[PDB]
PDB file of C-alpha atoms and ligand atoms in Angstrom:
ATOM      1  CA  UNK A   9     -80.686  22.127 200.904  1.00  0.00           C
ATOM      2  CA  UNK A  10     -83.290  24.910 200.941  1.00  0.00           C
ATOM      3  CA  UNK A  11     -84.287  26.712 204.132  1.00  0.00           C
ATOM      4  CA  UNK A  12     -87.644  28.506 204.264  1.00  0.00           C
ATOM      5  CA  UNK A  13     -88.243  31.466 206.585  1.00  0.00           C
ATOM      6  CA  UNK A  14     -91.184  33.702 207.470  1.00  0.00           C
ATOM      7  CA  UNK A  15     -90.803  37.438 206.995  1.00  0.00           C
ATOM      8  CA  UNK A  16     -91.439  39.510 210.060  1.00  0.00           C
ATOM      9  CA  UNK A  17     -95.094  40.517 210.046  1.00  0.00           C
ATOM     10  CA  UNK A  18     -94.178  44.180 209.515  1.00  0.00           C
ATOM     11  CA  UNK A  19     -92.104  43.344 206.407  1.00  0.00           C
ATOM     12  CA  UNK A  20     -94.812  41.074 205.026  1.00  0.00           C
ATOM     13  CA  UNK A  21     -97.204  44.000 205.502  1.00  0.00           C
ATOM     14  CA  UNK A  22     -94.831  46.316 203.627  1.00  0.00           C
ATOM     15  CA  UNK A  23     -94.582  43.887 200.729  1.00  0.00           C
ATOM     16  CA  UNK A  24     -98.381  43.520 200.553  1.00  0.00           C
ATOM     17  CA  UNK A  25     -98.753  47.304 200.474  1.00  0.00           C
ATOM     18  CA  UNK A  26     -96.229  47.574 197.632  1.00  0.00           C
ATOM     19  CA  UNK A  27     -97.984  44.812 195.672  1.00  0.00           C
ATOM     20  CA  UNK A  28    -101.564  45.923 196.309  1.00  0.00           C
ATOM     21  CA  UNK A  29    -101.501  49.744 196.283  1.00  0.00           C
ATOM     22  CA  UNK A  30    -102.493  51.474 193.049  1.00  0.00           C
ATOM     23  CA  UNK A  31     -99.430  53.495 192.095  1.00  0.00           C
ATOM     24  CA  UNK A  32     -98.419  54.145 188.505  1.00  0.00           C
ATOM     25  CA  UNK A  33     -94.875  55.517 189.051  1.00  0.00           C
ATOM     26  CA  UNK A  34     -93.283  52.070 189.251  1.00  0.00           C
ATOM     27  CA  UNK A  35     -90.022  53.032 187.510  1.00  0.00           C
ATOM     28  CA  UNK A  36     -88.478  54.219 190.798  1.00  0.00           C
ATOM     29  CA  UNK A  37     -87.676  50.591 191.667  1.00  0.00           C
ATOM     30  CA  UNK A  38     -84.546  50.900 189.512  1.00  0.00           C
ATOM     31  CA  UNK A  39     -83.263  54.034 191.272  1.00  0.00           C
ATOM     32  CA  UNK A  40     -83.677  52.264 194.600  1.00  0.00           C
ATOM     33  CA  UNK A  41     -81.753  49.147 193.570  1.00  0.00           C
ATOM     34  CA  UNK A  42     -78.981  51.199 191.936  1.00  0.00           C
ATOM     35  CA  UNK A  43     -78.769  53.285 195.122  1.00  0.00           C
ATOM     36  CA  UNK A  44     -78.390  50.091 197.168  1.00  0.00           C
ATOM     37  CA  UNK A  45     -75.639  48.911 194.805  1.00  0.00           C
ATOM     38  CA  UNK A  46     -73.864  52.267 195.095  1.00  0.00           C
ATOM     39  CA  UNK A  47     -74.008  52.011 198.905  1.00  0.00           C
ATOM     40  CA  UNK A  48     -72.547  48.492 198.810  1.00  0.00           C
ATOM     41  CA  UNK A  49     -69.752  49.664 196.523  1.00  0.00           C
ATOM     42  CA  UNK A  50     -69.022  52.613 198.835  1.00  0.00           C
ATOM     43  CA  UNK A  51     -68.696  50.156 201.723  1.00  0.00           C
ATOM     44  CA  UNK A  52     -66.141  47.813 200.152  1.00  0.00           C
ATOM     45  CA  UNK A  53     -64.219  50.809 198.801  1.00  0.00           C
ATOM     46  CA  UNK A  54     -63.968  52.329 202.281  1.00  0.00           C
ATOM     47  CA  UNK A  55     -62.988  49.047 203.935  1.00  0.00           C
ATOM     48  CA  UNK A  56     -60.302  48.462 201.293  1.00  0.00           C
ATOM     49  CA  UNK A  57     -58.523  51.673 202.356  1.00  0.00           C
ATOM     50  CA  UNK A  58     -57.416  50.042 205.602  1.00  0.00           C
ATOM     51  CA  UNK A  59     -57.291  46.430 204.343  1.00  0.00           C
ATOM     52  CA  UNK A  60     -56.423  46.257 200.623  1.00  0.00           C
ATOM     53  CA  UNK A  61     -56.728  42.457 200.729  1.00  0.00           C
ATOM     54  CA  UNK A  62     -60.517  42.926 200.807  1.00  0.00           C
ATOM     55  CA  UNK A  63     -60.254  43.547 197.046  1.00  0.00           C
ATOM     56  CA  UNK A  64     -58.529  40.195 196.377  1.00  0.00           C
ATOM     57  CA  UNK A  65     -62.030  39.037 195.392  1.00  0.00           C
ATOM     58  CA  UNK A  66     -62.128  41.672 192.648  1.00  0.00           C
ATOM     59  CA  UNK A  67     -60.742  45.179 192.186  1.00  0.00           C
ATOM     60  CA  UNK A  68     -63.407  46.487 189.790  1.00  0.00           C
ATOM     61  CA  UNK A  69     -66.245  48.518 191.350  1.00  0.00           C
ATOM     62  CA  UNK A  70     -69.186  48.705 188.955  1.00  0.00           C
ATOM     63  CA  UNK A  71     -72.891  48.161 188.305  1.00  0.00           C
ATOM     64  CA  UNK A  72     -74.256  46.144 185.361  1.00  0.00           C
ATOM     65  CA  UNK A  73     -77.867  46.143 184.164  1.00  0.00           C
ATOM     66  CA  UNK A  74     -78.725  43.016 182.205  1.00  0.00           C
ATOM     67  CA  UNK A  75     -82.130  42.551 180.534  1.00  0.00           C
ATOM     68  CA  UNK A  76     -83.129  39.155 179.182  1.00  0.00           C
ATOM     69  CA  UNK A  77     -86.409  38.984 177.252  1.00  0.00           C
ATOM     70  CA  UNK A  78     -86.273  35.181 176.917  1.00  0.00           C
ATOM     71  CA  UNK A  79     -86.256  34.726 180.711  1.00  0.00           C
ATOM     72  CA  UNK A  80     -88.249  37.947 181.297  1.00  0.00           C
ATOM     73  CA  UNK A  81     -85.671  39.041 183.872  1.00  0.00           C
ATOM     74  CA  UNK A  82     -83.879  42.286 184.634  1.00  0.00           C
ATOM     75  CA  UNK A  83     -80.679  41.699 186.597  1.00  0.00           C
ATOM     76  CA  UNK A  84     -78.841  44.381 188.582  1.00  0.00           C
ATOM     77  CA  UNK A  85     -75.248  43.255 189.304  1.00  0.00           C
ATOM     78  CA  UNK A  86     -72.763  45.048 191.533  1.00  0.00           C
ATOM     79  CA  UNK A  87     -69.334  44.213 192.880  1.00  0.00           C
ATOM     80  CA  UNK A  88     -70.008  45.777 196.275  1.00  0.00           C
ATOM     81  CA  UNK A  89     -69.431  44.367 199.740  1.00  0.00           C
ATOM     82  CA  UNK A  90     -72.023  41.588 199.396  1.00  0.00           C
ATOM     83  CA  UNK A  91     -74.232  40.081 202.082  1.00  0.00           C
ATOM     84  CA  UNK A  92     -73.610  37.381 204.662  1.00  0.00           C
ATOM     85  CA  UNK A  93     -76.077  34.625 205.489  1.00  0.00           C
ATOM     86  CA  UNK A  94     -76.923  36.547 208.667  1.00  0.00           C
ATOM     87  CA  UNK A  95     -77.655  39.673 206.602  1.00  0.00           C
ATOM     88  CA  UNK A  96     -80.075  37.733 204.387  1.00  0.00           C
ATOM     89  CA  UNK A  97     -81.903  35.896 207.169  1.00  0.00           C
ATOM     90  CA  UNK A  98     -81.952  38.415 210.008  1.00  0.00           C
ATOM     91  CA  UNK A  99     -79.853  41.598 209.951  1.00  0.00           C
ATOM     92  CA  UNK A 100     -81.402  43.443 207.015  1.00  0.00           C
ATOM     93  CA  UNK A 101     -84.983  42.671 208.001  1.00  0.00           C
ATOM     94  CA  UNK A 102     -84.277  43.754 211.580  1.00  0.00           C
ATOM     95  CA  UNK A 103     -83.015  47.160 210.401  1.00  0.00           C
ATOM     96  CA  UNK A 104     -85.926  47.384 207.974  1.00  0.00           C
ATOM     97  CA  UNK A 105     -88.543  47.058 210.744  1.00  0.00           C
ATOM     98  CA  UNK A 106     -88.074  50.622 212.007  1.00  0.00           C
ATOM     99  CA  UNK A 107     -87.853  52.112 208.511  1.00  0.00           C
ATOM    100  CA  UNK A 108     -91.026  50.239 207.570  1.00  0.00           C
ATOM    101  CA  UNK A 109     -92.941  51.679 210.538  1.00  0.00           C
ATOM    102  CA  UNK A 110     -91.788  55.205 209.694  1.00  0.00           C
ATOM    103  CA  UNK A 111     -92.604  54.717 205.995  1.00  0.00           C
ATOM    104  CA  UNK A 112     -96.089  53.452 206.852  1.00  0.00           C
ATOM    105  CA  UNK A 113     -96.806  56.470 209.063  1.00  0.00           C
ATOM    106  CA  UNK A 114     -95.516  58.855 206.388  1.00  0.00           C
ATOM    107  CA  UNK A 115     -97.835  57.316 203.787  1.00  0.00           C
ATOM    108  CA  UNK A 116    -100.795  57.868 206.131  1.00  0.00           C
ATOM    109  CA  UNK A 117     -99.678  61.509 206.439  1.00  0.00           C
ATOM    110  CA  UNK A 118     -99.498  62.113 202.674  1.00  0.00           C
ATOM    111  CA  UNK A 119     -96.190  60.661 201.454  1.00  0.00           C
ATOM    112  CA  UNK A 120     -96.130  58.437 198.380  1.00  0.00           C
ATOM    113  CA  UNK A 121     -94.412  55.184 197.518  1.00  0.00           C
ATOM    114  CA  UNK A 122     -91.635  56.950 195.579  1.00  0.00           C
ATOM    115  CA  UNK A 123     -90.247  58.180 198.922  1.00  0.00           C
ATOM    116  CA  UNK A 124     -89.565  54.604 200.128  1.00  0.00           C
ATOM    117  CA  UNK A 125     -85.792  55.056 199.870  1.00  0.00           C
ATOM    118  CA  UNK A 126     -85.849  57.860 202.437  1.00  0.00           C
ATOM    119  CA  UNK A 127     -86.803  55.173 204.994  1.00  0.00           C
ATOM    120  CA  UNK A 128     -84.098  52.672 204.082  1.00  0.00           C
ATOM    121  CA  UNK A 129     -86.403  49.962 202.700  1.00  0.00           C
ATOM    122  CA  UNK A 130     -86.058  50.677 198.968  1.00  0.00           C
ATOM    123  CA  UNK A 131     -85.115  47.060 198.149  1.00  0.00           C
ATOM    124  CA  UNK A 132     -88.719  45.988 198.604  1.00  0.00           C
ATOM    125  CA  UNK A 133     -89.818  48.342 195.815  1.00  0.00           C
ATOM    126  CA  UNK A 134     -88.585  45.559 193.523  1.00  0.00           C
ATOM    127  CA  UNK A 135     -92.067  44.083 194.048  1.00  0.00           C
ATOM    128  CA  UNK A 136     -93.586  46.991 192.122  1.00  0.00           C
ATOM    129  CA  UNK A 137     -92.447  45.224 188.951  1.00  0.00           C
ATOM    130  CA  UNK A 138     -91.321  41.699 189.919  1.00  0.00           C
ATOM    131  CA  UNK A 139     -93.416  38.678 190.770  1.00  0.00           C
ATOM    132  CA  UNK A 140     -90.300  36.934 192.120  1.00  0.00           C
ATOM    133  CA  UNK A 141     -86.937  38.330 193.215  1.00  0.00           C
ATOM    134  CA  UNK A 142     -83.776  36.212 193.431  1.00  0.00           C
ATOM    135  CA  UNK A 143     -80.680  37.638 195.142  1.00  0.00           C
ATOM    136  CA  UNK A 144     -77.298  35.956 194.609  1.00  0.00           C
ATOM    137  CA  UNK A 145     -74.645  37.374 196.882  1.00  0.00           C
ATOM    138  CA  UNK A 146     -71.089  36.802 198.066  1.00  0.00           C
ATOM    139  CA  UNK A 147     -69.418  38.569 201.011  1.00  0.00           C
ATOM    140  CA  UNK A 148     -65.686  38.123 201.683  1.00  0.00           C
ATOM    141  CA  UNK A 149     -66.468  36.577 205.092  1.00  0.00           C
ATOM    142  CA  UNK A 150     -69.072  34.030 203.959  1.00  0.00           C
ATOM    143  CA  UNK A 151     -70.162  31.637 201.212  1.00  0.00           C
ATOM    144  CA  UNK A 152     -72.180  32.446 198.094  1.00  0.00           C
ATOM    145  CA  UNK A 153     -75.928  32.343 198.801  1.00  0.00           C
ATOM    146  CA  UNK A 154     -79.205  32.587 196.911  1.00  0.00           C
ATOM    147  CA  UNK A 155     -82.141  34.343 198.590  1.00  0.00           C
ATOM    148  CA  UNK A 156     -85.536  34.201 196.899  1.00  0.00           C
ATOM    149  CA  UNK A 157     -89.077  35.356 197.521  1.00  0.00           C
ATOM    150  CA  UNK A 158     -92.347  35.611 195.631  1.00  0.00           C
ATOM    151  CA  UNK A 159     -93.765  37.428 198.679  1.00  0.00           C
ATOM    152  CA  UNK A 160     -96.734  35.744 200.324  1.00  0.00           C
ATOM    153  CA  UNK A 161     -94.956  35.898 203.676  1.00  0.00           C
ATOM    154  CA  UNK A 162     -91.943  33.632 203.133  1.00  0.00           C
ATOM    155  CA  UNK A 163     -88.493  33.600 201.574  1.00  0.00           C
ATOM    156  CA  UNK A 164     -85.860  30.932 201.018  1.00  0.00           C
ATOM    157  CA  UNK A 165     -82.086  30.837 201.448  1.00  0.00           C
ATOM    158  CA  UNK A 166     -79.762  28.205 199.996  1.00  0.00           C
ATOM    159  CA  UNK A 167     -76.083  27.873 199.290  1.00  0.00           C
ATOM    160  CA  UNK A 168     -75.526  28.812 195.653  1.00  0.00           C
ATOM    161  CA  UNK A 169     -73.669  26.330 193.445  1.00  0.00           C
ATOM    162  CA  UNK A 170     -73.930  28.435 190.277  1.00  0.00           C
ATOM    163  CA  UNK A 171     -71.270  30.525 188.565  1.00  0.00           C
ATOM    164  CA  UNK A 172     -69.050  31.954 191.347  1.00  0.00           C
ATOM    165  CA  UNK A 173     -69.349  35.742 191.630  1.00  0.00           C
ATOM    166  CA  UNK A 174     -66.141  36.718 193.422  1.00  0.00           C
ATOM    167  CA  UNK A 175     -67.811  39.384 195.565  1.00  0.00           C
ATOM    168  CA  UNK A 176     -70.987  41.428 195.344  1.00  0.00           C
ATOM    169  CA  UNK A 177     -74.700  41.067 194.720  1.00  0.00           C
ATOM    170  CA  UNK A 178     -76.940  40.106 191.807  1.00  0.00           C
ATOM    171  CA  UNK A 179     -80.619  41.081 192.084  1.00  0.00           C
ATOM    172  CA  UNK A 180     -82.670  39.126 189.531  1.00  0.00           C
ATOM    173  CA  UNK A 181     -86.130  40.611 188.932  1.00  0.00           C
ATOM    174  CA  UNK A 182     -88.576  38.105 187.442  1.00  0.00           C
ATOM    175  CA  UNK A 183     -90.848  40.711 185.913  1.00  0.00           C
ATOM    176  CA  UNK A 184     -94.630  40.682 186.009  1.00  0.00           C
ATOM    177  CA  UNK A 185     -96.259  39.999 182.638  1.00  0.00           C
ATOM    178  CA  UNK A 186     -97.372  43.619 182.192  1.00  0.00           C
ATOM    179  CA  UNK A 187     -94.043  45.155 183.271  1.00  0.00           C
ATOM    180  CA  UNK A 188     -91.869  44.071 180.326  1.00  0.00           C
ATOM    181  CA  UNK A 189     -91.155  47.690 179.362  1.00  0.00           C
ATOM    182  CA  UNK A 190     -88.259  47.505 181.845  1.00  0.00           C
ATOM    183  CA  UNK A 191     -86.505  45.086 179.480  1.00  0.00           C
ATOM    184  CA  UNK A 192     -86.354  47.678 176.693  1.00  0.00           C
ATOM    185  CA  UNK A 193     -83.044  49.458 176.182  1.00  0.00           C
ATOM    186  CA  UNK A 194     -84.540  52.902 175.558  1.00  0.00           C
ATOM    187  CA  UNK A 195     -86.718  52.646 178.663  1.00  0.00           C
ATOM    188  CA  UNK A 196     -83.890  51.630 180.994  1.00  0.00           C
ATOM    189  CA  UNK A 197     -81.673  54.375 179.540  1.00  0.00           C
ATOM    190  CA  UNK A 198     -84.413  56.937 180.171  1.00  0.00           C
ATOM    191  CA  UNK A 199     -84.843  55.831 183.796  1.00  0.00           C
ATOM    192  CA  UNK A 200     -81.110  55.770 184.564  1.00  0.00           C
ATOM    193  CA  UNK A 201     -80.650  59.255 183.096  1.00  0.00           C
ATOM    194  CA  UNK A 202     -83.633  60.619 185.020  1.00  0.00           C
ATOM    195  CA  UNK A 203     -82.969  59.135 188.474  1.00  0.00           C
ATOM    196  CA  UNK A 204     -79.393  57.812 188.651  1.00  0.00           C
ATOM    197  CA  UNK A 205     -77.280  60.221 186.594  1.00  0.00           C
ATOM    198  CA  UNK A 206     -74.687  61.064 189.291  1.00  0.00           C
ATOM    199  CA  UNK A 207     -73.992  57.586 190.687  1.00  0.00           C
ATOM    200  CA  UNK A 208     -70.242  57.412 191.257  1.00  0.00           C
ATOM    201  CA  UNK A 209     -69.631  54.008 189.654  1.00  0.00           C
ATOM    202  CA  UNK A 210     -69.845  52.982 185.990  1.00  0.00           C
ATOM    203  CA  UNK A 211     -73.317  51.658 185.086  1.00  0.00           C
ATOM    204  CA  UNK A 212     -73.223  49.437 181.988  1.00  0.00           C
ATOM    205  CA  UNK A 213     -76.543  48.655 180.314  1.00  0.00           C
ATOM    206  CA  UNK A 214     -76.099  45.360 178.510  1.00  0.00           C
ATOM    207  CA  UNK A 215     -77.742  44.871 175.087  1.00  0.00           C
ATOM    208  CA  UNK A 216     -79.844  41.843 174.247  1.00  0.00           C
ATOM    209  CA  UNK A 217     -78.489  39.311 171.764  1.00  0.00           C
TER     210      UNK A 217
HETATM  211  N1  LIG B 301     -83.205  44.761 202.429  1.00  0.00           N
HETATM  212  C1  LIG B 301     -82.248  45.054 201.557  1.00  0.00           C
HETATM  213  O1  LIG B 301     -81.748  46.187 201.483  1.00  0.00           O
HETATM  214  C2  LIG B 301     -81.782  43.971 200.635  1.00  0.00           C
HETATM  215  C3  LIG B 301     -80.954  44.257 199.583  1.00  0.00           C
HETATM  216  C4  LIG B 301     -80.522  43.237 198.721  1.00  0.00           C
HETATM  217  C5  LIG B 301     -80.926  41.951 198.938  1.00  0.00           C
HETATM  218  C6  LIG B 301     -81.768  41.627 200.011  1.00  0.00           C
HETATM  219  C7  LIG B 301     -82.217  40.328 200.290  1.00  0.00           C
HETATM  220  C8  LIG B 301     -83.020  40.087 201.362  1.00  0.00           C
HETATM  221  C9  LIG B 301     -83.425  41.147 202.159  1.00  0.00           C
HETATM  222  O2  LIG B 301     -83.021  42.417 201.929  1.00  0.00           O
HETATM  223  C10 LIG B 301     -82.191  42.657 200.860  1.00  0.00           C
END
């Protein structure tokens, strides 16, 4: 059972700007997604201090980067707090509306797309390199869900029957045909070292078979 939703107009406008604007410094997408993972890991870690049972779904707090040239996907996996169905459908986009407006005004005043994370809407920078983004997520208080969008104004949400995750979030980037450099080990290593060197969780870059 697949539900289809419309993005808020302001978020659809943000995604169109990210897709259409000429901007060569695309590599910052990875910093933004790793930052989001780090925030999600901080959240479950903090909550576990007053309720240790929140880690019954997995004690390890980490980030994995998994390239797959056969599928042309780059997957960012974390074992953070995860997202509820309400987060996916409504809560995150509601918060993003104000950050989007501020980001838009900053761009008109001379900011550039690399500053997107300072406005809290860094997730959407995934569309600098991905034609489709799939998010698999599991929060302790909800079921495992798959969110997906190829932009164009709509996204889908369905219950996920795949491999159970325990807890956390998997962001699967279906890369554009000309963005396959982000599947190369040396390129990902370079980007992580440049932009994400002090993240406080182990980042494992998987090797292709
Ligand atoms: N906005 C976000 O920070 C975000 C992060 C991860 C997955 C998502 C899925 C749908 C909407 O937002 C998100």
